[PDB]
Each structure stands twice: as structure tokens, then as C-alpha cells.
Write a protein that binds this ligand. Structure first.
Ligand SMILES: *O[C@@H]1[C@@H](O)[C@@H](O[C@]2(CO)O[C@H](CO)[C@@H](O)[C@@H]2O)O[C@H](CO)[C@H]1O
Length: 492
């Protein structure tokens, strides 16, 4: 009798298991198993229900902040990567290097590495088990960055030999499960790493099988094909819970769903029609109709996980149908249909939400039409106008995701053409280097106000992430877009 193999029915798969390129709603549930970070979040600290904020040692046994721009890490000794190579400071230095991650040479290998990274200087290797991470300018975000999904540790020699692309198809990490196979757009299979330095894996094997249609995914749990299924909606809860051997398990996660624009298109170069579309979205009626009250509507680009830079005083985002109609008229919009691209229901409630917004927009005089696209076939940028997206809020600080995504160095401005006000970009630079205080707090509030004025994206809500599982598979969700199995997976 060997350990049970775990069968997962998932909404989607990443195109690469290179851990930075796998950042998405579907990559972390896999790369969290293959790799470790220096510091890890313990969502279950002191009995919490999967939402604790505590950081604990992981690949680093201890660490110390030296000054405003450096942190020294002492590494756990005798940790082995899946191919046997011992983890050393040289691997950590390479993970956070100019070459691999944030320098100009990393642009083709990890396209978002520089824009999502801090203003890093080269790491300093002090000895085989001691490494210092540094920024060129002050950064009080080194610790939260190192605990995050940007900071999974890769093996220097193996990664350099294969290159980022081939490493992404045959990954080697220090994590509790090791790579077996990756069939693009179909499945990922991992196996127990019984040499793991931490809590030993409890499943013999893990299979991530794509089941893009949620109804088929629910039928596969009912029939006994899957142990756990992902990305359901609250409308599936009553049916699943009627089965005595199945149950749903859900939690609000530190992510928001949104829609955004290709601002290289003429109709979206100016803010007026973006604002008109934002002002016509009735979020509470969408939360009632599609989420059974379980989703949460934030007061702007502002979330409690930001800690000292969360503002609980902020007003709700605006809803004004009559001001929206007047903006449609002033924009010169001529009635032509505007497309909105969606990858089916990769996002829970994506197509039901869009159908509701299409009617809301018809009532303001804007004609929007759904265009679907297949997994791994994202349209050419110049064929897209509106599209859905999401952002995981990956730091204990407001820096992420407004600055990495929407800042002067980010993709919304550089790729998608948002001509941000100069004041917004000046504030992004200030919050990057400032320590917490009134100046920094007020700068984030001004950035949030400009974001709502400009509408380069429209925040909808934080999703209630719904899984379903067999009652004999013990596993709790966490408040983030990943699955955790360390000390959180057992059978019987
Ligand atoms: O939020 C998703 C984005 O991260 C991105 O995701 C994938 C995941 O591997 O990343 C590549 C591009 O880096 C993309 O082709 C894959 O789907 O895009 C999707 C689709 O827009 C986002 O939903």
C-alpha cells in the first residue's frame, strides 16, 4: 500500500514552469510544489483559517536586515535540489541576479522580471551558506519580496545549461514534489520528493489535468475522476454539497478581477470612454447575482493585506449611470461595437459577468461584444480592445500591484499604451524608496485617486475562490491564488 495519488481538475495551466514566468492564477499551485523560497508565509499560524500573515524561515534558517537597502540570509545546510545538487549561496545569488532576473539581458528570458523586481544591486555571496540581497536605492520591501512568488530559488548550473525556456519545460527545485511530465495545454504530473528538507510529501503523485469547462469539471468530481477541482462559482455550492461524500471549500483571496483596455486603440487613447464604461458597472448587483454575496468590492486599489498602507477610510468606487451617458456623448463614440476578449471561464464568472456588463453598457449607449479565445491562443495585441484580467496582491504593502503593473516601468504603460499623468509616475518613484509614514501613505492615496480618474483598468471585486473536494481528502484553501500542501494534505 503506497500513498494515494492526488488528481486535480483545474481551470488552466501555465505555458512554463519557470517560476517567475508561471506567475498567474494557474501557475503557483504547481510551482509552489516544485520550489521553495528563503522565507515562507504560514497561512495556518496559530490556528488561523488559511489567512494568517506570519512569515517563517524556509530555505533561509535566519535573516537580518543590515540597513535600508540590504538583508543578509543564513541558508539551511544540506538542502538538495531534485537532481542532487546541494543548495548554496551561489544558487540564491543567481536567482536574484542581473543575468537571470532584473538586468537588461533577462528581458527575453523573463519578460516581466525587471518590471516586477525591486531596484536590485547584485547579490553578495559571503560564503557557501551566506548571501546578502541588496537594492541600489532604499527599499523596505526586500523581506516581503523574498517571501513572494517572484523569489522561488532556482539551481544556477542546471538553469544556465538548459536556458529559461527548456528549464520551464523540465524544472528542478528543492520543493516537496518533483517534475515528471508536462503536456502543453493538457497536464502536469509531479511525484513525491522523499528527500525533502521540510514536512515530507503525503501524496505519491500529483496530476494537474486541465478541464476548461466548469460543468465538465463538476461532473468529473461527481463521477470520481478528480479528488479536488478548482475555480468554481458560488452557484455550484448547493449541488456539490448535496452529495454526502463531497464538499466545497472556499475563501476570499488576495486578488482582484478586473477589465482593462488596449490604450493603443484610438477609441481608448483618451480616458473619457474608459471612465464611461467604469461608471456604468453596478458591482453590487453582480456580487448578488453571480457570487451569492461572497465576493468583496474594494474601496479602490486598496486591500487589507497592504497593512500600514491599507486605507480603511476610503470611499467606494463611483457608480454614476447619468455621468457615464454624458461621457459617452462627449467622447464622440459613434456606436461601433467594441470587442471584449475572454478565455472562456478561466476566471470564475468571466462570461456571466461580461453578459451582465454588456447590458449595463447598452443602457449607456455603448455596444460591446464578447470574443472568446482558446487557452494558449491570446489574440494579437492590436486585435484586442477590452479584455479581462486579474492581479494577485503579492506583498504586505501597497507597492504591489499598482507599481509593478501600472507604474512607469510596467506593461500597462509600455505595452498597452496608458499615457499616465506625470504626477502618477513621480509618486510611483517616491513610494518605491520611502519608508512607511504619512508622506508615503498619502502618496498611495493620491495614486489611487488618479487611477480611478484615468481608468486604465476597472476593478470589479475580490473573488471568493471556490474549490470542491472529496471529504476523505483533507486540505484547506489559503487566501491566495495557490494551493498549499505542506502540513495541509492527508487522506482517509
Ligand atoms: O493572468 C494571465 C496572465 O498571467 C497571462 O498568462 C499566461 C500564463 O502562462 O502567461 C502567458 C504570457 O506570459 C499567457 O500566454 C498565458 O495564458 O495571460 C493570461 C491570458 O490573458 C492571463 O489571464
Amino acid at each position: 500500500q503506497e500513498r494515494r495519488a492526488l488528481r486535480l481538475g483545474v481551470n488552466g495551466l501555465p505555458n512554463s514552469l519557470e517560476p517567475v514566468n508561471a506567475i498567474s492564477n494557474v501557475g503557483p499551485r504547481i510551482v509552489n510544489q516544485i520550489f521553495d523560497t528563503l522565507i515562507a508565509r504560514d497561512f495556518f499560524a496559530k490556528g488561523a483559517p488559511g489567512n494568517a500573515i506570519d512569515l517563517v524561515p524556509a530555505l533561509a534558517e535566519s535573516w537580518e536586515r543590515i540597513d535600508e537597502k540590504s538583508v543578509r540570509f543564513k541558508l539551511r545546510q544540506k538542502v538538495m535540489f531534485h537532481d542532487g545538487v546541494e543548495l548554496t549561496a551561489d544558487d540564491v545569488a543567481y536567482t536574484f541576479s542581473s543575468e537571470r532576473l532584473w538586468g537588461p539581458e533577462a528581458i527575453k528570458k523573463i519578460p516581466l522580471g525587471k518590471s516586477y523586481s525591486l531596484d536590485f544591486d547584485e547579490p553578495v555571496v559571503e560564503d557557501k551558506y551566506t548571501v546578502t540581497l541588496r537594492t541600489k536605492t532604499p527599499s523596505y520591501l526586500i523581506e516581503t519580496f523574498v517571501a513572494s512568488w517572484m523569489s522561488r530559488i532556482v539551481p544556477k548550473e542546471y538553469y544556465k545549461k538548459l536556458g529559461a525556456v527548456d528549464f520551464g519545460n523540465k524544472p528542478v527545485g528543492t520543493g516537496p514534489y518533483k517534475f515528471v511530465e508536462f503536456v502543453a495545454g493538457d497536464r502536469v504530473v509531479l511525484e513525491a520528493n522523499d528527500a525533502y528538507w521540510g514536512p515530507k510529501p503525503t501524496a505519491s503523485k500529483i496530476t494537474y489535468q486541465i478541464v476548461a469547462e466548469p460543468a465538465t469539471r463538476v461532473a468529473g468530481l461527481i463521477s470520481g475522476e478528480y479528488d479536488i477541482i478548482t475555480t468554481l462559482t458560488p452557484d455550484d455550492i448547493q449541488l456539490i454539497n448535496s452529495y454526502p461524500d463531497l464538499e466545497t471549500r472556499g475563501t476570499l483571496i488576495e486578488n482582484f478581477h478586473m477589465f482593462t483596455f488596449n490604450m493603443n486603440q484610438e477609441v481608448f487613447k483618451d480616458k473619457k470612454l474608459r471612465r464611461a464604461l467604469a461608471l456604468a458597472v453596478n458591482r453590487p448587483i453582480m456580487v448578488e447575482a453571480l457570487w451569492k454575496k461572497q465576493a468583496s468590492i474594494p474601496a479602490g486599489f486598496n486591500f487589507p493585506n497592504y497593512g500600514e498602507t491599507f486605507d480603511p477610510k476610503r470611499k467606494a468606487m463611483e457608480y454614476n449611470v447619468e455621468e457615464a451617458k454624458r461621457l459617452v456623448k462627449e467622447s464622440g463614440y459613434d456606436g461601433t461595437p467594441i470587442t471584449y476578449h475572454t478565455m472562456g471561464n478561466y476566471y470564475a464568472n468571466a462570461m456571466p459577468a461580461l453578459m451582465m456588463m454588456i447590458e449595463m453598457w447598452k443602457q449607456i449607449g455603448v455596444n460591446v461584444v464578447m470574443k472568446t479565445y482558446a487557452p494558449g491562443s491570446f489574440p494579437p495585441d492590436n486585435q484586442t480592445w477590452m479584455r479581462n484580467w486579474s492581479n494577485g496582491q503579492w506583498m504586505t504593502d501597497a507597492y504591489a500591484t499598482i507599481v509593478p503593473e501600472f507604474g512607469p516601468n510596467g506593461q500597462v504603460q509600455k505595452r498597452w499604451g496608458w499615457k499616465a499623468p506625470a504626477e502618477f509616475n513621480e509618486l510611483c518613484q517616491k513610494v518605491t524608496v520611502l519608508p512607511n509614514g504619512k508622506e508615503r501613505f498619502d502618496a498611495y492615496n493620491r495614486m489611487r485617486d488618479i487611477f480611478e480618474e484615468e481608468a486604465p483598468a476597472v476593478i470589479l471585486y475580490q473573488p471568493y475562490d471556490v474549490y470542491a473536494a472529496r471529504k476523505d481528502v483533507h486540505w484547506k484553501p489559503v487566501s491566495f491564488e495557490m494551493m498549499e500542501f505542506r502540513n495541509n494534505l492527508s487522506f482517509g
